[PDB]
Amino acid sequence: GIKFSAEALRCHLRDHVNVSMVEVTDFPFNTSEWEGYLPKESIRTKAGPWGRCAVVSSAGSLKSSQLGREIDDHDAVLRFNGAPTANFQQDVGTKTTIRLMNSQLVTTEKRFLKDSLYNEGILIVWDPSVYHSDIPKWYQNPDYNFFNNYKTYRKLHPNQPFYILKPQMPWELWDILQEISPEEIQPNPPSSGMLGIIIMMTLCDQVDIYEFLPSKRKTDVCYYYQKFFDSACLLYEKNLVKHLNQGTDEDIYLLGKATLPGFRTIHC
């Protein structure tokens, strides 16, 4: 089992994980090649602070969940990668406030530069670095070289806020996942879902998380918008979220809903 309490784990996350974006003052994003590309205003001036927020997993158990009104009844909603609301609004809601994407999508998915779903809300892209790398070292060897398509999207959509997560943040979170499950952890970075939860805990007083912990609807379907199975179709991440959950067991089983307090509200 996990050795620390929920209250202590929340404080450890607040203190060890630096939720911040690459800034125009971080070398080499202050080079002439990068001038004008990054947002100059912090995400904290575009995003909140908010009272009640939703994080919507991309899990297949959202299909037929009819969670759309529950999700939309929030100040802000975060979604992941290419997860759509169109044709699914009754299950997953209509609002998209923040969309967190991995660098694989930005680098290799041609629809990133074509599909209008990406044009709504605030965008964040993240890329897994080598563990313990700083920004200059990471820049020389990203997991996916997403920088060109980032720049292209910025030019096509200059007034949509589009941030890059600092590379240190996923591994800081990994450190805490290892503390709580050292014998089971894999040397892969946390999932986008886990990152998005921590991001919303930084911007919100209360974070409701839908179908990250499995509900009655647990299914073989990997993602709610999947049309069939292919090569496209975590345990310690779920245990962390369960450990921090303030909601009822009934909310998990029926609504697939966990509720986590935001960092602004905890006492350390």
Ligand SMILES: CC(=O)N[C@H]1[C@H]([C@H](O)[C@H](O)CO)O[C@](OP(=O)(O)OC[C@H]2O[C@@H](n3ccc(N)nc3=O)[C@H](O)[C@@H]2O)(C(=O)O)C[C@@H]1O
């Ligand atoms: C084939 C593949 O690469 N799948 C990965 C996809 C894929 O790269 C993107 O959709 C871009 O195409 O990205 C991930 O997955 P993705 O961002 O799509 O999914 C969002 C988050 O929902 C949670 N989830 C999803 C499915 C499921 N059955 N259970 C879940 O709990 C996870 O927390 C997940 O992160 C990712 O970024 O994390 C991780 C996935 O492994």
